[model samples]
Target: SMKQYRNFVDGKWVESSKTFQDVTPIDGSVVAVVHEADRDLVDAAVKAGHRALEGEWGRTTAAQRVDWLRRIANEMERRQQDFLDAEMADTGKPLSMAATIDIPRGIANFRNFADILATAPVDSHRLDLPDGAYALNYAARKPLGVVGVISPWNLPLLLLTWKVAPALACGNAVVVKPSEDTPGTATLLAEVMEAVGIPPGVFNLVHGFGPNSAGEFISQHPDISAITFTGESKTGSTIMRAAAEGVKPVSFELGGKNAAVIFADCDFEKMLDGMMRALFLNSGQVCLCSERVYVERPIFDRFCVALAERIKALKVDWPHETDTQMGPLISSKHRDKVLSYFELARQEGATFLAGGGVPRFGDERDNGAWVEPTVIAGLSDDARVVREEIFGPICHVTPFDSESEVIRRANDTRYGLAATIWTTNLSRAHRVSELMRVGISWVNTWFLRDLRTPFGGAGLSGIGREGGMHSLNFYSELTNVCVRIDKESP
Candidate 1:
């Protein structure tokens, strides 16, 4: 395949002197060769962002920004196949999935944020007096000047736009650094922005593999006021420390060891569907996926069997076929890492209820890399496989006794990203949900989200919330200004 990629700098498609290959994980073949932007390029990108923040995109009105963002939706629709093809190959995503979910979410992030920008107040207004005079007491949000966004590999365009849309809505200029492994879709996003005529320096896309060229430069850049990141917990900590040294703000969506609790009082059909989706969708690559599941003792055995059958029924196709329901890991290296978890589960005395090892695929058997959907049983809580994030298609199921005990079990982990409570009892759902320490909790359903709500994790999962006003707040500097015109004394 011959696809050329370039970095978007100052509203121009700039090709670097050095370039790196972007490959499809499905067959280990090069999908495209993308430009690897250096620190000089990052510096240029940051300066461009600063220039935009100080000049064209500085206005609070953002009338053109709203127009452009909506047009981005239109352009995203027009180029639907472009994104689908890229993400399918780059992320090893199923075709129908990328089209229906990932790409649409990316488009919605822009459109929704644009709608918010059209009506969201730049500042809250109140007429009052702090001292001995009448004044207009209000608070305003100002752009955080040049900002950096470092996105991960799994949901490249979707998560990248999640940060970019809000930053742009809050009137901040951005320099985005997408994961090097999956750069094609990001390159496609830059093309979409360019096609929609987003002003120069307002949005920039850069991808690379070098130490500083990839992530560190953007996080440590002097000109950047804030950094928005979505990745591993260790990397998030490093970026946070570097930014903290500069006293800079960071919005992080970090790792999750999420859990799903199933109760006998629940609707079996609905709960099973949600549990399966939460466990296996995206091949369990999603951080929000529930790798650890605790089923009520009465239904524990039945649930385990059902989950194993569903996983066995998963159709993994070679070379990104139309009939495929699941694809391989992002790379062969990751496939090996995921399979190692199976070996660990075995050593720790965890029984394999479904797949516990690697399996071969047809047609491209030798060339393609694959991991089977794994389900395990009877693993202790303290086991390495239980305590740590496997980041694979492995789902561990165990039996729980009481409502109080189940809540305690689910909340026992260090991660507090997401958890689901499967129950028909309304009172119990709310009560148990309250005791579970997670950023977001679902009752009877999983992954049902309203974009307006805050999304993040607690404990080791992450530090801050993102979405709605939270996103606006992180990307902007909130200022409280008081003036007295009514001459009232405080």
Candidate 2:
């Protein structure tokens, strides 16, 4: 019998009348059947979240929450194989990618938030008056009630926990709507939450598509105190409007048409390696993936040729295949979307240096969401191919004469999620990165993240930061309490 994924409502698995196929991008197989949530299920999840807040979960001290987070991480580590298998099945990412990145990061998110909240601070101040009276003011952090978490499919569990861990650690219950493309790990996480004995209703899962299903239901529910999402810019805008109805705050890590500027003075080999990772990591589905490459003029021709060759050499194969460097896009719909841009790039007079179409796998995998790792040149910055977010293993390279020129071209897009600068010159590295107008600026590196640093987007990329203290702050509502003291009064 095929696996059936169900909603975790009030600490129990619940079925739905509406069901959807959970398809694997590996071979277009239905890996499981996901029970789709309707309005009633979503309402139950949100109400359960609130009830948890008013019951055992809300009363949990910070130390208890930290302990729960630690246990979740520990249990996840113990059952890491289950998570890795599910992640690879859902995303069709290479096993190496899921084991090293997706799974570990998901586990780490829990532990990291535990560490962040263990000694997390509350603001305090002392004020003295001329009459020799003093007052003490302190800001106490409280959970933002029930947080509606809508996570993306790209990194599935990792990104889901990126929002959920902190929300849980801050003593807020969560109603999670994992991306429609990848729902396996989020459902698995509910088991971990159960094993750790997190209070009933503290964490709930609802599986379904956006607009008419769980996503829309959660976002519009007045009982949902706030919302945190990570996905498309257009979807983020729609969610923002939905959130506005209730005047609820939203934290969004949206889309990106990120850029990479490689100066001629860069360490050539290192730049090549970093650029390869930046352009094609997760099959270029990452929001931080560099879809636009602005090479310094002196090295433009060389960089384009080198990057094209590197891209061509990338292994587009079965997810479990050894040495497979790239895998399929999340679904056929996304693959078609990416291919449409490839066609548009051609119509817009862009020159394809390497790949411009799909890879024929000579098997059932051909029916999957496979696209060739592609590199293009000869498109103007204003070209739709250059400006649009083609979330696949594709990028357009443009040459720039100077630092100012590259920076100007790079920041021209409305999306400012992340940018990378590759150069050895210390001052240019610092100066250029500071002017990149992105929430995250990588110098001579790509995809290198320290969970302690703040992470989010600038313009259309995203609205708020997550990671470490930022995560804690976003999940919390702070209130200041002032105490008056007089020497004459006791």
Candidate 3:
């Protein structure tokens, strides 16, 4: 059964002036009707957040807050099945992905932050002044009052948890605006929060579009002390501009044109299999997906042939099928956008190594915007497909002769989110990992993430970091407390 979705304000679900219908991408069936939160509702949620900060939340000790976060994690685990179904229905992700990557990662993120905060030195001291005077060794980590988190639709539950868990752990109340395309999971998460006894106004959920509603409301709200976003680079830049007007702190995890390097020394079959998975996982909608590949010149021809053979063998079906290897893209619109990239590649003289067009699986209606996993070869390092962040199941392969040449070609783009290197030689792995210009570098692996490690990007990819103790700083502000004591008199 579909739950009635509403805005969480003052610790209760409330209706707005307008409502929108949420549809499942698998069959385009209306799943639930959600309140379309407008400017007024956004303002009310922000005010409620402030009230919570001033009320019980602000007065609570760190240990008490950690207890609340742990309770939320426990409740989420109890309702794991519900989360899995909602995520699959709303976002069209495979059930395996929802179970393994989305749900467990979300829970682990909350618990990890809680563990870090339990012993972190929120208060610390430095010695720089004269010896005669006694300097107070104290520090204060204060909340940013109210934080505005605007989540996207690609990975709804995971992204929401990434923002909410750390914000609450750092003692800030949050007002969340989930993308209109996937509101069911966010509403479900809000219910779990309430059941776990998270006080009213401490956490709220609002559903609406980005530009007219969430973007305008969250960035312009005067009481919001900080804003954190995970989406496209263009929208991230817009939010940064708006946040700067009020001097509010802003953090972003934006788009990427990530790269993967295949050296000749690595096992050929193993590297090919990993590349296939990295390029087509989640229909290649991940922000850090390897859209471009640079293979050593000696093995370039063999690598491309093996890669094409592997992709052609993948089973394509609806997300519900246990044997399905790849699911549909988020929607028809996105599907078309991705196909258009393939056309552009052909026009620019790239060759389709394998699976370039949309799959025609007997019935047109049965194929709900599924593109065959595609592999393109003979693209130059400066080609459009190689340089842009095409968030689809597409990989462009090019050849390189030397390590320095490959590194230079891989780092040519403005994006520096993540990169992977496949090599058996220990020195080469260490050297290439160090030389790669990305926030995260993986040797002989792809898409490897840890909840306790910092995850973010460099250059145009993103701003600041999220995860571990670094995430706490994004949601809270640091204050230095210095008090002089009469050492001689005492």
Candidate 4:
């Protein structure tokens, strides 16, 4: 029997005529045949979201929403194993990552947003000011009816909840479309929706590819009031173009050609550990991970050799394994795409410090999606190897002559998503952070999430920030209420 995963529309599980296979990257197997959402489904989802907003989700108080969100978080916590299993099978993410980062972060998003909703008073504000008259000015923040949330596959459940938490906290009904590659956990989240006290139609889930007609339907849907998307740069551009037609607001966290500038004065081993985590974690699948390293000329060669040894030592094991550090690429297609970069690097005459192709997992690894953690050198700054988002376990290292020149080179990319500088020199750390064009910068560490701070990319990387208050504001429509009272007229 085929394992079927259906869409959650309104409060119902919906099945479609067309379906896509949810393939496991570990050993190349279809874990589930998931339903795909069409235009009709999209329209139904929007209507459902808006209907709930007009009724319970819109009419109800934020306190109720908070209560409901807490229940869902509690339920998610209870079902940690369920989510971990699904995510592991779907994306081939290691169990350790699933437990530590994926499921835990999803739970945190809901709990944090619920805490903010329960305590914060952001709806109406009165201002006492020096004005011409004794007029009172107030402000109101309204929910933007229906919101569309699209999440990436890197950390499937966590990213999805990150968008949904704020949208729901701000009192907007959400229709989510998770990545088709890793759709099982989201399909299963419908169980959480059914279990929680949130009103019917307040939350919905769909699974489909984000290209071609299906993707266009969601991007161009006229009824979707706002959009929160996390994906590639080119696709995000298409979404923005389509969204402009409806004048709908969109928050996009797109591609990043991020760099890590490791200085000679820094703690070499600590920075080295951070760099390994940044570049090789998740097989370099994370959007914010370091793709380029501009090390001080004094320690560049040493850094490269050490990083190569680390890469050679990395364990690319089955996702189901408890101690697996890294797993396969999402699928055979993605594996081939990642390998193509190695082909490009070879053509460009780049030097391979270590790991140029697939990792050896013995005889059964023939069809599995695997890419060895790779290190490269002798590539020009302008070469495609150094310029584009490979999104694989491949990183480039280069020696830098001066801090000033290094900053210029680091900021040269069109992307401004993230960057990190390794230096004990307080001035240099602060100076590099300030000058880097990216939205988020790390002085000595990378990928640290405070959750309260703003998180987004600039330029081609993204459109808006989405963390804590930034998310709350983005999902709402702020209105000013000014009352002019004449002293004589009452």
Q: Which regions of candidate 2 are displaced past 4 Å?
A: none
Worst 10 residues of 1 by lDDT: 360-369
User: By TM-score, who's the top model here?
Assistant: 2
Q: Choose the strongest candidate by lDDT.
A: 2
Count of backbone clashes, every candidate in sequence: 7, 0, 0, 0
Candidate 1 structure lDDT? 0.83
- For candidate 2, lDDT tens digit of each residue in 277-379? 8988899998899999988889888887777778767888878986898988999999989999999988999888888888887899987888888888887
The TM-scores, one per candidate, come to 0.95, 0.98, 0.96, 0.96
Model 4 per-residue lDDT tens digits across residues 24-49: 88888878898999988888888999
Query: How far in Å is the alpha carbon of 232 misplaced in model 1?
Result: 0.3
In order, candidate lDDTs are 0.83, 0.90, 0.84, 0.86
Alpha-carbon shift of residue 409 in model 4 (angstroms): 0.5
CA lDDT, candidate 4, residue 124:
48
Name the candidate, 2 or 4, with the larger lDDT value.
2
Model with the higher lDDT, candidate 3 or 4: 4
Q: What is the TM-score of candidate 2?
A: 0.98
Give the Cα error of residue 242 in candidate 1, in Å: 1.3
Candidate 3: lDDT over CA atoms?
0.84
In the range 246-358, model 3's lDDT, one tens digit per residue, is: 89998889879998999999977778777877898888988878988888989988887777778878877767777677787887778889989989999989888888887
What TM-score does structure 4 among the candidates reach? Answer: 0.96
